[PDB]
């Protein structure tokens, strides 16, 4: 906290010198931001342990300059495909090509692309590779599926706590509760079942005092972190039902309706990263995936959020008001908006957007740093909905 008087005294009473000092500090902060923005990504390939144990094993690193092209999308609650093109003389390309016919190797490969020193990470399993010839010049085009595709291959039986070919009662499995807790709990129950149903399920999986401390979760490849049933702050509830439906298909409607986000992170303990907040979070192995349902939009919160605004007075805070039967929700504007700023906004080095206080407005004009491709609006279509069949 260098006050103006202190800076002026350090500059010996020269206002111009003091302001040049302040300008130099601002310039160095801007330069740090620009370097962070323009930093090269870190592309690393990992493999399963050949002996069949847990923990991903480091294969190698692809240089950004040594790539031919790359494309990695991050989508909201949707699986995406990452594409990486390499020259066939590249050592990781050679390794990938020899992988199908190498009997000493497991056939699954994981890519991790780190932006901003691992703050942003795109991790995914290998989908395929293709040897493509452009004018007699061969290159390897490698396609990965992002780590949200595991929810397509995770499915919820009617009774996830019992053997499947014996008795699956009732006809469908239904779980009701706070939205984040229920989605995370469905995912966790199916993860438990597919890891083996070895132990007895407590009433609330995310009540960490219910789980024994002697239990070993290191063999799990996927984990789910969530708060307990009572501690969950999800304002709205949800009912999820399944009869051998895939988990993503079960939870898509609830995620859309509650504006929730699934975040996946592959914990590379070889990089020093750790995890907490879920059972067995201390003994997890390298490259284990962790899921978390978050409320990044904060639309259903009590204080509301920003749904609109103008460039001359910023955003406008609105709160959801539910009509008769809670089927319909409208927006009521907070005329006297007095929400406090997040404590993170007062911390040095913070850059993220808090859900309760959105701040990023991207303006397009004659002098704009972005290009706006297309903005499309369309009105609602059907006034009434009919759902049913047999009761």
């Amino acid at each position: 906290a260098n006050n103006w008087t202190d800076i002026l005294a350090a500059s010996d009473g020269d206002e111009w010198a003091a302001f040049k000092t302040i300008e130099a500090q601002a310039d160095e902060v801007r330069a740090g931001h620009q370097a962070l923005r323009r930093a090269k990504p870190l592309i690393r390939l990992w493999m399963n342990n050949p002996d069949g144990s847990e923990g991903l094993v480091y294969v190698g690193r692809v240089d950004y300059d040594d790539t031919i092209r790359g494309s990695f999308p991050f989508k909201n609650n949707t699986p995406s495909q990452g594409v990486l093109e390499l020259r066939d003389d590249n050592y990781l390309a050679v390794w990938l090509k020899q992988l199908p016919n190498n009997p000493e190797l497991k056939k699954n490969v994981v890519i991790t692309v780190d932006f901003y020193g691992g703050k942003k990470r795109w991790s995914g399993l290998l989908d395929k590779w293709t040897i493509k010839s452009k004018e007699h010049v061969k290159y390897l085009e490698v396609t990965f599926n992002d780590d949200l595709t595991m929810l397509q291959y995770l499915l919820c039986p009617p009774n996830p706590a019992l053997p499947i070919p014996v008795l699956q009662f009732p006809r469908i499995f239904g779980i009701a509760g706070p939205a984040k807790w229920a989605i995370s709990t469905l995912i966790f129950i199916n993860l438990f079942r597919v890891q083996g149903n070895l132990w007895t399920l407590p009433d609330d999986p995310f009540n960490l005092e219910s789980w024994d401390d002697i239990l070993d979760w290191s063999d799990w490849q996927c984990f789910v972190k969530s708060n307990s049933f009572l501690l969950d702050d999800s304002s709205v509830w949800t009912f999820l039902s399944s009869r051998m439906n895939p988990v993503d298909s079960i939870i898509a409607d609830a995620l859309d309706d509650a504006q929730l986000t699934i975040t996946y992170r592959r914990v590379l303990t070889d990089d020093g990263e750790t995890a907490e907040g879920f059972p067995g979070a201390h003994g997890i192995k390298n490259g284990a995936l962790v899921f978390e349902i978050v409320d990044n939009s904060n639309a259903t919160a009590l204080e509301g959020t920003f749904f609109s605004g103008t460039i001359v007075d910023g955003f406008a805070r609105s709160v959801l008001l539910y009509g008769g039967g809670f089927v319909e929700d409208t927006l009521s504007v907070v005329s006297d908006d007095q929400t406090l700023q997040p404590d993170e906004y007062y911390q040095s080095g913070w850059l993220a957007t808090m859900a309760k206080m959105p701040w990023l407005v991207v303006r397009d004009n004659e002098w704009t740093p972005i290009e706006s491709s297309d903005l499309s609006w369309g009105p609602a279509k059907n006034v009434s909905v009919i759902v049913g069949g047999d009761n």
Binding site: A1, N2, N3, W4, T5, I7, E15, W16, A18, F19, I22, E23, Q25, A26, V29, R30, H33, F306, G309, I311, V312, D313, G314, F315, Q341, E344, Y345, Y346, Q347, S348, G349, W350, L351, T353, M354, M357, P358, W359, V361, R363, N365, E366, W367, T368, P369
Partner: protein, 290 residues
């Protein structure tokens, strides 16, 4: 001639006089036919219309200056030294200054190597020790500029107000910068100057925007130009995150000026303000415009 002087200040701080009084004293002169050097390139946009096409706007393009220099010396070894120094004066990553000085003052353009230089004749250059280097440089910021006008207003009062005289004497709009000390809540002007880019020309004639309340030690720089983020604090705090979608929208239009008001409130120590007004021009020399 003595009416125009052209210099290059390289990335390494070297000084070369390519044209004007004292040109060639460092061994390098400027050959004729230099292009995209005077007027800032602009492309105009047109939409289909009932009477042909309708004007849609203008966009300023980056400068692609192709020019030749001539490096000369009596002996080939000294010519080689001169050629190496000229090569060291240039880079791709960092920009070197190109200063044009006339009776209208000195205006500089920051240029970098767009591609590799093309040196020498068809034979080896040691035969002649007098060889041309063709340079394709580029100006990402295409406007010629002078040193900006800077004003300072410090105060000891908890609440105070001031007026900064401001005037755009150039032919292109300029974007103002502020340096604001902390603690304190600042009200900064964002006058439209009658500009109708947002269809709020005279609606925003006296627009003022309130910066977020700065905590102790959070001295901020508020740059209105679109190249850079608006609010940056010197202590790294995210000041703009607390600035709920607000921004400075209007530049200082050419031919416009006034006493723009700056207000300071809730400043127990009493803060200081600095205003920086750039001097951007689209031409190396031009008479002042009223």
């Amino acid at each position: 001639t003595d009416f125009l002087k052209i210099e290059l200040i390289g990335r390494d701080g070297s000084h070369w006089v390519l044209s004007g009084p004292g040109m060639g004293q460092q061994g390098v002169t400027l050959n004729p036919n230099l292009q995209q050097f005077y007027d800032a390139p602009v492309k105009t946009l047109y939409v289909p219309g009932p009477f042909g096409e309708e004007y849609a706007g203008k966009r300023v393009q980056r400068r692609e200056i192709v020019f030749s220099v001539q490096a000369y010396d009596e002996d080939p070894d000294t010519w080689s030294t001169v050629d190496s120094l000229w090569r060291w004066a240039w880079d791709y990553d960092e920009e070197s200054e190109l200063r044009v000085s006339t009776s209208d003052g000195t205006r500089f353009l920051k240029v970098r190597l767009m591609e590799e230089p093309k040196p020498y004749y068809e034979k080896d250059p040691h035969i002649t020790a007098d060889n041309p280097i063709v340079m394709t440089v580029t100006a990402t910021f295409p406007y010629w500029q002078d040193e900006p006008e800077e004003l300072i207003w410090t105060t000891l009062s908890t609440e105070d107000m001031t007026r900064f005289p401001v005037r755009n004497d150039g032919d292109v709009p300029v974007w103002l910068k502020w340096t604001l000390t902390a603690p304190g809540l600042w009200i900064l002007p964002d006058f439209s100057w009658g500009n109708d880019m947002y269809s709020r020309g005279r609606e925003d004639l006296g627009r003022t925007v309130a910066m977020p309340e700065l905590v102790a030690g959070e001295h901020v720089s508020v740059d209105s130009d679109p190249r850079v983020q608006t609010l940056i604090a010197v202590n790294g705090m995210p000041t703009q995150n607390r600035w709920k979608g607000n921004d400075l929208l209007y530049p200082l239009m050419p031919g416009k000026g006034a006493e723009i008001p700056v207000q300071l409130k809730n400043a127990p120590e009493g803060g200081a303000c600095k205003l920086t007004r750039p001097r951007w021009y689209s031409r190396p020399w031009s008479r002042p415009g009223v």
